[PDB]
Amino acid sequence: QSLKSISILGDSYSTFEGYLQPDTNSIWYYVSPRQQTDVTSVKQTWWHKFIKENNYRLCVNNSFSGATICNTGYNQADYSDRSFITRMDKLGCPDIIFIFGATNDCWAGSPLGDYKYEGWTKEDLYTFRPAMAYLLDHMIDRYPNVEIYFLLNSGLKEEFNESVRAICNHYNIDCIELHDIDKKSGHPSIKGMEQISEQIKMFMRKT
Amino acid sequence: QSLKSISILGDSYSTFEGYLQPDTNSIWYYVSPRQQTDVTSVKQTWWHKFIKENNYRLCVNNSFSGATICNTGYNQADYSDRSFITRMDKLGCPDIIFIFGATNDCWAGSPLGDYKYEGWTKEDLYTFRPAMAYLLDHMIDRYPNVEIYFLLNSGLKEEFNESVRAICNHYNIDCIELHDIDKKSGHPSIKGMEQISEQIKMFMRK
Amino acid sequence: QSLKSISILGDSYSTFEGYLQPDTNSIWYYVSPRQQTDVTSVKQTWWHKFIKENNYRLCVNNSFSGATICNTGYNQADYSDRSFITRMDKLGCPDIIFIFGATNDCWAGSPLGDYKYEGWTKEDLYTFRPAMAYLLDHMIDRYPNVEIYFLLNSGLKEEFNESVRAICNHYNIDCIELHDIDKKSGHPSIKGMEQISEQIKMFMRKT
């Protein structure tokens, strides 16, 4: 009888003013938009749409605007305070987790690094492939028997697409490859948010 | 297999010493009573009784003694720190939510205001109908696919009964109208707590 | 479809670096061991093993290294800040709770006290039997319809074994009596953690 709940570990694309935990996380989508976007309600987000329309509950949305998977941010800055690998332990007690990241690592120019599936050092976690592997490894152990789905944004560099896809395959994690997402200011529009939700449902109907 | 969990967004009637989140919320019911009441145990509360007896789990009880639904309190004081519309975002991750409020808005003499179903300003949420509507609107979005039930106390002014009932109907929220609840010092007694719990079951059953 | 979640209220034996809530709790098991033990991963702990292998989810692990059930610690120190009866209210919203304590009360030499099933004072809760009853009483009310299991460590003094067993019987709580748990530095080894997990599965099947 009890419906499965979903948490989100995301970035700008999964933020919405007043729905972020911790509440100090940076927001991209406001009720009264700050940037030029047509999205003005949480009901229009990809995650609220998917959760509400597929009979799920909302658990924790730990999304942070401009966050990278790894600890190298924009202009080589240290993003250890806001990275996905730092925030992965605060997602409540969900039944399903969506990971929606890697866009910022792609556009920040974070070093891609080498594939590393164990013995991660502090130096390694400043590069992408070791941080992506460390994320999935630690989350599989932290969230036993929780369904984990990686959402891969459309329009990223192929080196990030292939890295995300290879590391997800290593850990047997489903990687949902988003395509043709309609964007405004490089972020999903109302149409784009609907396309993300319908593409997740397509992937669930196939899998 | 996994049993549904319940959270409460209440006021004096749903408080019990040591069961409130955040733990800094004002309590009405203490283990050793400080008010004239016969209730001395959490096992006697309407919410513990309903949850335990109908095979549910307890999630979060966010109840605050004397808290109003809107931001106008007793003697026209600003209750923005304790109102239901301020505390509605901290109820854990439940399967069911009970909202049990409007008694303090009724006895504080909070301005009733006009019905407003969008564009709520800071000024509007100091009045009852806009705050009621803002509460249900925001909670439906914050708690998708969570069963929400408004519990309406017995003995309130008809302007508050009718406002609560009209705003619940707008948002398609069940409003359980409590009747003849036995009280001591204006708060449910052991009998009253049992009557609240039995009246919720009969609403569920029908 | 939604799987039951489990929370742990433990001591040294249920700790693991990075899996404790609150994160300020004392840890015994580190990734790189500080004490002489062969355990180096959360995957080897009795609780992660049981949860992962019996198709459950992890809720909250509130374990504190060296914490006592009652408020008297080692060398008659006041353990009111870290006792089980102080920490019992912060276990999330689980479907099942494991209580794994009393080892420290046994080796600290905490006063055993008299059996007391009501009217507990601050003075009473410095002794074992009143604190152990206060723990089960308050947790049954705080966690309605949650399955509660007391795990009793092997090799403790019989006065503690018999007290725990009598107080669990009073409150109709299952007391899982662990036997022959393989230990290193007085704490479960990899073998010991597997024996705890298999003995919980065995108890669950016969009850």
Side-chain angles (χ1 to χ4, degrees), chain A residues 1-33 37-204 206-207, chain B, chain C residues 1-35 37-74 76-207:
Chain A
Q1 225 179 321
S2 172
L3 305 177
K4 286 186 168 170
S5 71
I6 306 204
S7 288
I8 304 104
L9 183 67
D11 58 19
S12 322
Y13 284 31
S14 303
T15 67
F16 203 84
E17 169 181 24
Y19 287 73
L20 305 183
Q21 298 193 58
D23 57 13
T24 53
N25 286 3
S26 286
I27 302 147
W28 200 86
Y29 294 94
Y30 293 86
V31 168
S32 178
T37 181
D38 57 347
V39 170
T40 65
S41 178
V42 72
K43 299 161 162 93
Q44 301 170 314
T45 61
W46 72 261
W47 49 273
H48 197 275
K49 281 189 123 294
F50 184 77
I51 288 166
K52 190 183 166 211
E53 295 164 19
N54 295 91
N55 208 39
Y56 295 113
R57 288 183 299 113
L58 172 59
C59 184
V60 166
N61 186 346
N62 192 340
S63 295
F64 197 122
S65 189
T68 49
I69 288 185
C70 70
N71 292 337
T72 299
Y74 289 93
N75 292 267
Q76 205 218 107
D78 191 330
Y79 271 27
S80 291
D81 60 316
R82 75 195 69 192
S83 59
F84 280 51
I85 61 162
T86 292
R87 295 184 296 107
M88 68 182 175
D89 281 297
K90 295 178 85 192
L91 292 162
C93 188
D95 297 275
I96 304 170
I97 296 157
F98 286 104
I99 306 167
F100 193 7
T103 299
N104 295 300
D105 302 77
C106 177
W107 304 125
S110 59
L112 193 62
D114 313 324
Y115 292 106
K116 186 142 183 186
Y117 295 105
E118 47 149 325
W120 304 278
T121 65
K122 194 190 166 177
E123 300 100 88
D124 296 320
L125 297 172
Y126 281 111
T127 72
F128 189 69
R129 291 149 165 178
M132 258 286 299
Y134 175 92
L135 179 63
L136 300 196
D137 185 86
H138 284 260
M139 282 180 70
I140 289 157
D141 291 345
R142 176 56 194 78
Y143 299 108
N145 294 307
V146 165
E147 295 164 48
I148 293 154
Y149 298 95
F150 198 91
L151 303 183
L152 180 59
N153 192 12
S154 59
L156 309 185
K157 296 169 199 180
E158 187 53 25
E159 290 88 10
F160 286 81
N161 295 334
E162 183 44 57
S163 290
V164 166
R165 173 192 307 141
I167 296 162
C168 282
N169 184 69
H170 184 272
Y171 289 105
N172 214 77
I173 294 302
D174 283 325
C175 175
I176 310 186
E177 303 198 61
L178 300 172
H179 56 87
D180 307 303
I181 306 304
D182 186 80
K183 288 157 185 186
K184 289 168 173 77
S185 314
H187 288 72
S189 61
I190 291 161
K191 182 174 164 196
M193 291 293 203
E194 193 181 22
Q195 287 168 321
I196 294 159
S197 186
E198 292 305 304
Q199 285 175 36
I200 293 163
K201 186 183 181 279
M202 280 168 28
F203 186 91
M204 299 305 180
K206 289 179 283 107
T207 307
Chain B
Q1 263 281 87
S2 173
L3 305 176
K4 286 186 167 171
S5 213
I6 306 205
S7 290
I8 305 103
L9 186 75
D11 64 19
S12 336
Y13 284 31
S14 310
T15 57
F16 202 83
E17 169 181 24
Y19 287 74
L20 305 184
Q21 299 192 57
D23 58 10
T24 54
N25 286 3
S26 286
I27 301 148
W28 200 87
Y29 294 95
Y30 292 85
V31 167
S32 178
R34 305 192 171 169
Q35 334 276 358
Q36 162 50 32
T37 182
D38 57 347
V39 170
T40 65
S41 177
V42 72
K43 300 160 162 93
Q44 300 170 314
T45 62
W46 73 262
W47 50 273
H48 196 275
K49 280 190 123 294
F50 183 79
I51 288 166
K52 190 182 165 211
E53 296 164 20
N54 294 91
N55 207 39
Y56 295 114
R57 288 183 299 111
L58 171 59
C59 183
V60 166
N61 186 346
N62 192 342
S63 292
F64 196 122
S65 190
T68 54
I69 288 184
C70 71
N71 293 337
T72 300
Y74 289 93
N75 291 272
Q76 311 309 105
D78 191 329
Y79 274 24
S80 290
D81 60 319
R82 333 110 186 284
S83 66
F84 280 51
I85 61 163
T86 291
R87 295 184 296 107
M88 68 183 175
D89 51 355
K90 296 178 85 193
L91 291 163
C93 184
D95 298 275
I96 304 170
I97 296 157
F98 286 105
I99 306 167
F100 192 7
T103 299
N104 298 297
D105 303 76
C106 176
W107 303 126
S110 308
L112 193 62
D114 312 324
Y115 293 106
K116 185 142 184 187
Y117 294 105
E118 47 150 328
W120 305 277
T121 65
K122 204 125 63 244
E123 300 99 89
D124 296 320
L125 301 172
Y126 280 112
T127 72
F128 189 68
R129 290 149 165 179
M132 258 299 297
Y134 176 92
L135 178 64
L136 300 195
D137 185 87
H138 284 261
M139 282 180 69
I140 289 157
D141 291 344
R142 186 169 295 275
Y143 300 108
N145 293 309
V146 165
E147 295 162 58
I148 293 154
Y149 298 95
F150 197 91
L151 303 183
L152 180 60
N153 192 13
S154 59
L156 308 185
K157 296 168 199 180
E158 186 53 25
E159 291 88 9
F160 286 81
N161 295 334
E162 184 43 57
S163 289
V164 165
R165 172 192 307 141
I167 296 162
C168 282
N169 177 74
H170 185 271
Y171 289 104
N172 213 74
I173 293 302
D174 283 326
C175 176
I176 312 187
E177 305 198 61
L178 300 172
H179 55 88
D180 307 301
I181 306 304
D182 186 80
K183 288 156 185 186
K184 289 168 172 77
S185 309
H187 288 72
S189 62
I190 291 160
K191 184 174 164 195
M193 292 294 204
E194 193 180 21
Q195 287 168 321
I196 294 159
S197 178
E198 292 305 305
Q199 285 175 34
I200 293 163
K201 293 172 187 44
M202 285 326 217
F203 185 93
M204 293 317 184
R205 195 162 310 282
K206 73 168 180 159
Chain C
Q1 227 181 104
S2 173
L3 306 176
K4 287 187 167 170
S5 212
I6 306 204
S7 290
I8 304 103
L9 179 65
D11 65 23
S12 348
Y13 284 31
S14 305
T15 55
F16 203 84
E17 169 181 23
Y19 287 74
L20 305 183
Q21 298 193 57
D23 56 13
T24 52
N25 287 4
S26 287
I27 301 147
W28 200 86
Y29 293 95
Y30 293 85
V31 168
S32 177
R34 289 234 273 151
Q35 290 280 2
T37 182
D38 57 347
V39 171
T40 64
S41 178
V42 72
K43 300 160 162 94
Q44 300 170 314
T45 64
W46 72 261
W47 49 272
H48 196 276
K49 280 190 124 293
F50 183 78
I51 287 166
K52 190 183 165 211
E53 296 164 19
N54 295 91
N55 207 39
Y56 295 113
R57 288 183 300 111
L58 171 60
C59 184
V60 166
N61 187 346
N62 192 340
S63 301
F64 196 121
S65 188
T68 45
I69 287 185
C70 70
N71 292 338
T72 300
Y74 289 93
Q76 311 309 106
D78 191 330
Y79 270 27
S80 290
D81 60 316
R82 75 195 69 192
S83 59
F84 280 51
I85 61 162
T86 291
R87 294 184 297 108
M88 68 182 175
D89 52 354
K90 296 180 192 193
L91 292 162
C93 185
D95 298 273
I96 304 170
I97 297 157
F98 286 104
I99 306 167
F100 193 7
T103 299
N104 292 299
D105 302 77
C106 177
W107 304 125
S110 308
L112 193 62
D114 313 324
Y115 292 106
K116 215 182 178 78
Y117 294 105
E118 47 150 319
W120 305 278
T121 65
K122 194 190 166 177
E123 300 101 88
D124 296 320
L125 297 170
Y126 280 110
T127 73
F128 189 68
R129 290 148 165 179
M132 172 76 204
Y134 175 92
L135 179 63
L136 300 195
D137 186 86
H138 284 260
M139 282 180 70
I140 288 157
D141 291 343
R142 174 59 185 80
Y143 299 109
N145 292 308
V146 165
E147 295 164 48
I148 293 155
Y149 298 94
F150 197 91
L151 303 183
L152 179 60
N153 193 11
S154 59
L156 308 186
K157 298 166 192 180
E158 187 53 25
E159 290 88 10
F160 286 80
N161 295 333
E162 184 44 57
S163 290
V164 158
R165 172 192 307 141
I167 296 162
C168 281
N169 184 73
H170 185 272
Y171 289 104
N172 213 77
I173 293 302
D174 284 324
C175 175
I176 312 194
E177 304 198 61
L178 300 172
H179 55 88
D180 307 302
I181 306 304
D182 186 80
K183 289 157 184 186
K184 290 168 172 77
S185 315
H187 288 73
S189 61
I190 291 161
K191 183 175 164 195
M193 292 292 203
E194 193 180 22
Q195 287 167 321
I196 294 160
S197 178
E198 293 306 305
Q199 285 175 35
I200 293 163
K201 294 174 180 52
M202 253 299 311
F203 180 86
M204 291 305 189
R205 288 206 313 268
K206 80 184 156 259
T207 315

